[PDB]
Design a protein around this ligand. Structure first.
Ligand SMILES: [Fe+3]
Length: 187
């Protein structure tokens, strides 16, 4: 991310080893139970979205998310175990995050559950001069590991909508408030 990238190519996210995306992973009931039980202050629609760090033991409305993370992922990367460290982050329209790689204190395998509304995440590789985009939908799970987690940067653009292609038309879809829950372990 430094703009306008004419030397660069946009590739399918399927080319990035260690991206696994599961649409409609969480039932609506699970999403509503979670949202109902976040402190109301965290969900303010005004100004920049707030954030909350949680650590074991998590309450049931959070802790249940561990059950929707694929067992093969936890076996391969988390020594069969469940998440230890969780950040809940709200994004009001215009909020995002600059390109980064998650801190080395976390080791491999990062799980991100999405709530409330859809957004677009962009992966960047400066050395390859490549970009890739993924639409993170309400109720989805993103797993980031390996090449995705170490070689590439990820970001969420600071804007109020996203151009989204569907059924051959491209629309500007305004963003609504979004909440993510990021689940990690500590080395
Ligand atoms: Fe990150």
């Amino acid at each position: 991310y430094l703009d306008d990238f004419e030397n660069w190519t946009v590739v399918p996210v399927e080319t990035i080893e260690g991206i696994n995306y599961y649409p409609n992973c969480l039932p609506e009931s699970v999403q509503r139970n979670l949202i109902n039980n976040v402190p109301k202050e965290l969900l303010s629609i005004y100004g920049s979205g707030k954030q909350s760090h949680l650590y074991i033991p998590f309450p049931a409305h959070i802790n249940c998310l561990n059950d929707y993370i694929p067992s093969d992922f936890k076996q391969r990367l988390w020594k069969g175990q469940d998440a230890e460290a969780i950040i809940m982050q709200v994004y009001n329209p215009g909020d995002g995050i600059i390109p980064h790689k998650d801190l080395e204190m976390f080791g491999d395998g990062v799980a991100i559950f999405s709530f409330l509304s859809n957004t677009t995440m962009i992966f960047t590789h400066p050395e390859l001069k490549l970009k890739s985009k993924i639409r993170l939908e309400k109720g989805s799970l993103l797993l980031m590991s390996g090449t995705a987690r170490y070689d590439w940067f990820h970001e969420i653009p600071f804007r109020a909508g996203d151009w989204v292609m569907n059924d051959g038309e491209e629309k500007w879809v305004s963003r609504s408030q979004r909440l993510s829950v990021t689940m990690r372990r500590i080395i």
